[PDB]
RNA sequence: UCGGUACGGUUUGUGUAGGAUAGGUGGGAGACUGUGAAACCUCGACGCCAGUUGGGGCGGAGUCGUUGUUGAAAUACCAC
């Protein structure tokens, strides 16, 4: 509400459908202004998410990431060591890894534990879990499987989530990224949601759409076009 | 003049507190030029939720931005 918030992005129009090459170009010049932030997607989906099979719910593998260090901790024993620090992990904990969680030392992003150790995971969660660092086995942070769990944090998987009123938020990394490595993340998105798409759907799918990053109006977006991202 | 729809802008709600968990939901350490106890709308209905708020007819003139997560996102206020 300030004259720095109608500075950034001033020539943005409201009345003109705008492609992906632009919103890419407009989300550069958006960053002209402020300082570095997480861009936002928000798509207002043709769904009604009060029958219960017409939630939607799903991931996608971000071919650039996600613009986060992904610091890991690992409950690593036995071979669990030697594939846990291949894969890209700085932390590689043991046994006694639930006193240095408890005692003071969060220096991490997300923690990943085997299945030899979830006897003790639960007395870890709880100071975890509303700092959002705690292992979770429905959303593919814990396996047996270290050399790929670890990618999954690495790869960037943003996992959406449709909310009560039909409306999805979705991230494609930091807003000084280049254009063409910001389209490949914003294809991907709309190439899988369209996959996960229900079975009931009635009218348009994607209807509205719109990609902001740093302190100003959306940009809007145009659903007609989903072969161009790139 | 009285209505319906589409689009666009502001505002209203919240057992319980510091912006009545500043609605629901996701992002998120940087947004603001700010004496504000206060005079000029006494928040612009409402003044019951109890203090939401005078959002600038002040002053670009500097000391309420930052801060407590103790509540079923509080915050670093916005990218709905």
């Given at each position: ?62 071919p ?21 620090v ?23 992003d ?29 959303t ?13 944090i ?77």
């Open positions: 509400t300030s004259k720095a918030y109608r500075a950034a992005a001033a020539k943005v129009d409201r009345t003109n459908l705008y492609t992906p090459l632009q919103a890419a170009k407009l989300a550069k010049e958006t960053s002209s202004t402020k300082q570095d932030a997480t861009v936002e997607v928000a798509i207002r989906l043709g769904v009604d998410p009060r029958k219960a099979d017409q939630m939607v719910r799903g991931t996608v593998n971000l650039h990431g996600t613009g986060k260090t992904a610091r890991v901790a690992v409950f690593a024993v036995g071979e669990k060591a030697d594939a846990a291949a894969a890209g992990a700085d932390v590689v904990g043991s046994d006694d890894l639930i006193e240095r969680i408890q005692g003071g030392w969060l220096e991490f997300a923690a990943i534990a085997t299945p030899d150790q979830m006897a003790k995971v639960g007395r870890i969660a709880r100071v975890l879990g509303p700092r959002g660092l705690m292992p979770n086995p429905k593919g942070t814990v396996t047996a499987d270290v050399a790929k769990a670890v990618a999954d690495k790869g960037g998987k943003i996992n959406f989530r449709v909310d009560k009123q039909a409306n999805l938020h979705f991230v494609i990394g930091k807003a000084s990224f280049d254009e063409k490595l910001l389209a490949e993340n914003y294809g991907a998105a709309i190439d899988e949601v369209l996959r996960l798409k229900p079975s009931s759907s009635k009218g348009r799918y994607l209807k509205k759409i719109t990609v902001s990053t740093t302190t100003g109006p959306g940009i809007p977006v145009d659903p007609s076009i989903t072969r161009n991202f790139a």
